[PDB]
Amino acid sequence: SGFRKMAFPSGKVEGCMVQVTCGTTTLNGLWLDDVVYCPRHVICTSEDMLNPNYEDLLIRKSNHNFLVQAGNVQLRVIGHSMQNCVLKLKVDTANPKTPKYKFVRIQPGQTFSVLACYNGSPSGVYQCAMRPNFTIKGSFLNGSCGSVGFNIDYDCVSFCYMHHMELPTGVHAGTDLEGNFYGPFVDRQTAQAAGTDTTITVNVLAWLYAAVINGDRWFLNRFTTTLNDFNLVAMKYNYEPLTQDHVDILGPLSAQTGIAVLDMCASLKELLQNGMNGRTILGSALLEDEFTPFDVVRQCSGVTF
Amino acid sequence: SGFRKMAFPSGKVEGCMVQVTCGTTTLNGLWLDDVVYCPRHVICTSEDMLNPNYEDLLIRKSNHNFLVQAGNVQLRVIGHSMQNCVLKLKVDTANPKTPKYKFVRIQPGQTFSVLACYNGSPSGVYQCAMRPNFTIKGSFLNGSCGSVGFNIDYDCVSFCYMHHMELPTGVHAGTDLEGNFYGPFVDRQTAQAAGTDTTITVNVLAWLYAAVINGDRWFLNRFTTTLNDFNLVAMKYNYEPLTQDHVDILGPLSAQTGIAVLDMCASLKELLQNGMNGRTILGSALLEDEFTPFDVVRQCS
Numbered sequence: 001s002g003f004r005k006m007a008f009p010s011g012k013v014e015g016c017m018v019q020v021t022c023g024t025t026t027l028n029g030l031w032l033d034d035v036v037y038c039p040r041h042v043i044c045t046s047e048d049m050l051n052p053n054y055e056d057l058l059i060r061k062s063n064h065n066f067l068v069q070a071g072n073v074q075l076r077v078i079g080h081s082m083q084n085c086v087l088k089l090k091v092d093t094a095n096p097k098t099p100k101y102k103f104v105r106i107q108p109g110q111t112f113s114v115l116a117c118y119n120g121s122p123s124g125v126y127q128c129a130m131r132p133n134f135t136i137k138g139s140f141l142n143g144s145c146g147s148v149g150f151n152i153d154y155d156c157v158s159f160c161y162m163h164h165m166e167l168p169t170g171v172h173a174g175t176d177l178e179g180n181f182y183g184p185f186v187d188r189q190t191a192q193a194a195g196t197d198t199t200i201t202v203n204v205l206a207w208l209y210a211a212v213i214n215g216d217r218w219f220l221n222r223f224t225t226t227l228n229d230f231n232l233v234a235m236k237y238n239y240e241p242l243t244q245d246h247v248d249i250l251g252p253l254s255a256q257t258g259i260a261v262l263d264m265c266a267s268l269k270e271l272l273q274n275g276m277n278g279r280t281i282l283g284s285a286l287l288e289d290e291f292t293p294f295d296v297v298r299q300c301s302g303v304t305f
Numbered sequence: 306s307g308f309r310k311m312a313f314p315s316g317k318v319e320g321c322m323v324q325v326t327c328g329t330t331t332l333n334g335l336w337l338d339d340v341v342y343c344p345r346h347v348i349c350t351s352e353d354m355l356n357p358n359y360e361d362l363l364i365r366k367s368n369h370n371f372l373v374q375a376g377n378v379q380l381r382v383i384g385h386s387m388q389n390c391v392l393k394l395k396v397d398t399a400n401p402k403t404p405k406y407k408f409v410r411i412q413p414g415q416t417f418s419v420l421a422c423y424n425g426s427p428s429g430v431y432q433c434a435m436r437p438n439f440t441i442k443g444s445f446l447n448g449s450c451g452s453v454g455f456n457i458d459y460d461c462v463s464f465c466y467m468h469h470m471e472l473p474t475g476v477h478a479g480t481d482l483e484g485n486f487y488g489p490f491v492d493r494q495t496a497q498a499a500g501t502d503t504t505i506t507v508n509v510l511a512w513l514y515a516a517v518i519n520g521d522r523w524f525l526n527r528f529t530t531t532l533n534d535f536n537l538v539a540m541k542y543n544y545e546p547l548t549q550d551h552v553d554i555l556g557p558l559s560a561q562t563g564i565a566v567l568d569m570c571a572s573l574k575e576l577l578q579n580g581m582n583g584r585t586i587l588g589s590a591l592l593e594d595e596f597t598p599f600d601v602v603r604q605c606s
């Protein structure tokens with residue numbers, strides 16, 4: 001038993017991280033097959049980051065302007081192109097450690113593991129959620145751009161995130177591996193702010209089921225609620241509305257524990273109005289929303305990768 | 306910026322995990338060089354779990370009684386021995402993925418990463434602390450024995466934990482890689498319970514410094530305290546006593562932030578007295594104690 005914020009094993013991704021340098025800017029790249037992916041702002045100088053014209057900067061750069069280092073071996077760049085906010089560097093050698101992989105774009109509320117890297121070397125791994133406002137609450141220092149987020153399904157690595165920037169509140173924004181930003185942000189050092197963040201209701205409910213599975217059931221009650229009545233309350237607390245799809249997804253946990261979803265919603269509604277009243281749930285004094293229903297089933301059933 | 310419960314990248318350990326089967330028991334083993342380490346209770350029968358005589362049980366086994374599988378390849382066992390509560394299986398092949406590694410025994414309050422495995426395959430990685438009562442608050446299901454805890458420094462893996470058992474409160478107990486249990490626990494299914502769990506005070510203080518480093522100062526106050534007065538108060542909340550050694554260890558963070566250690570102690574006293582009053586610290590509504598001073602410096606710098 002027990003329940004932890006658990007990341008995917010990172011070995012398959014560690015073997016793909018390299019160091020990319022252009023001029024004085026050094027960050028991380030993702031080496032898959034014979035291509036290295038990294039943020040396009042690697043070609044910017046400290047002064048070109050305010051109003052960059054990426055077309056112009058890239059046109060003026062050459063293959064040899066890019067220094068790629070895989071460990072202590074330097075990869076020869078034989079081509080370069082841009083796709084949205086990601087730079088693609090062709091190298092003359094395929095990564096022998098390339099795993100089975102896909103590029104996937106995730107939606108708000110879904111979770112993934114972040115491999116934080118510096119100078120092409122992985123330093124740590126942690127589990128994150130894509131917030132409803134399309135930011136992630138990560139832990140990144142300078143030089144961490146190009147760090148990637150991923151999931152593992154069967155033996156296939158699904159890359160979903162590449163880190164680009166930090167917003168004034170200390171939250172983080174990035175792109176998918178095709179260079180499309182998550183959220184309404186741009187890779188420029190102009191004033192930007194994320195919209196109001198809301199709570200991922202369906203994940204909170206999944207985590208309450210994990211709490212029950214692990215023996216925490218003090219917060220339950222005999223009452224139920226309608227989806228309409230619950231959503232009226234949730235919207236007043238900056239909670240995401242719960243849809244019928246969300247309820248269906250919690251079916252497995254609803255059956256395993258014998259607690260109807262709308263019964264748990266009544267528990268959550270009461271928890272929102274009254275609070276936790278000095279008690280904790282699974283060792284937390286807050287309502288945790290960075291576990292999806294699948295995450296709960298995955299951890300409570302010992303799925304391996 | 307930001308602050309998260311961050312584990313070490315697990316690749317170096319993933320390459321060492323194998324499956325070990327003896328009789329009907331299947332669990333995880335750690336394949337380093339030409340030796341596989343696993344809990345000795347893999348040799349127990351369903352009837353031998355209360356008062357096993359492991360010496361006697363092992364004498365009766367032969368090399369071919371142990372089935373070791375690295376992926377889809379079976380490793381030939383050519384020898385076996387016991388070191389305390391850990392079984393050592395000599396195989397005819399050195400693991401080509403063996404990293405630079407050490408065996409270390411950690412002290413309560415120290416943190417490490419756990420690679421949870423089943424049938425020799427990793428399922429997840431998470432960060433843990435050795436509690437003052439010598440348990441860990443992990444996430445483990447049946448079949449997880451042999452999962453290991455570790456740190457990585459430079460490119461050297463320091464193995465510090467191997468999982469053996471779960472105690473009635475849902476907490477977990479295991480050994481170092483020399484087979485010596487942390488705490489007074491034994492690999493027998495006789496009644497055992499962990500002592501009262503306390504809060505790792507020095508780690509809470511490090512985490513408050515991390516909050517300041519990250520721009521949060523709402524919990525500070527104008528007061529200071531003596532070390533003795535702090536410990537008299539803290540122990541009333543089931544907090545571990547803070548020693549002068551702990552104070553010395555917080556020196557670097559005190560200097561970086563300009564906040565004396567005993568001034569931060571005064572802040573903690575008030576937080577225990579008042580609670581958070583609807584506020585959070587580094588995204589938590591509780592005082593977190595699973596970050597060491599070393600962890601804070603590494604993540605924030």
Ligand SMILES: *[C@H]([C@H](C[C@@H]1CCCO1)NC(=O)[C@H](CC(C)C)NC(=O)[C@H](Cc1ccc(F)cc1)NC(=O)OCc1ccccc1)[C@H]1CCOC1=O
Pocket residue numbers: 025026027028041044049140141142143144145146164165166167168172186187188189190191192193306
């Ligand atoms: C990585 C780096 C990652 C970032 C640093 C701390 C953790 O995440 N990315 C940047 O620095 C990025 C680069 C521009 C997009 C080209 N810019 C920002 O993150 C800045 C804020 C920042 C700058 C320096 C830092 F050390 C930390 C944070 N974002 C920004 O300006 O936001 C818009 C805004 C402007 C003014 C007022 C309000 C809001 C890569 C950068 C260079 O090398 C890397 O590895």
Ligand SMILES: CC(C)C[C@H](NC(=O)[C@H](Cc1ccc(F)cc1)NC(=O)OCc1ccccc1)C(=O)N[C@@H](C[C@@H]1CCCO1)C[C@H]1CCOC1=O
Pocket residue numbers: 001330331332333346349354445446447448449450451469470471472473477491492493494495496497498
């Ligand atoms: C040989 C034993 C060391 C094996 C070990 N006993 C235990 O834990 C048991 C509890 C238990 C949990 C779940 C189970 F299903 C079976 C048993 N403790 C215990 O008697 O306390 C003492 C005590 C006794 C009376 C009252 C109070 C405390 C054991 O079951 N270890 C497994 C790891 C556990 C499972 C969940 C996380 O930790 C994995 C091993 C077993 C065989 O193959 C494996 O992989």
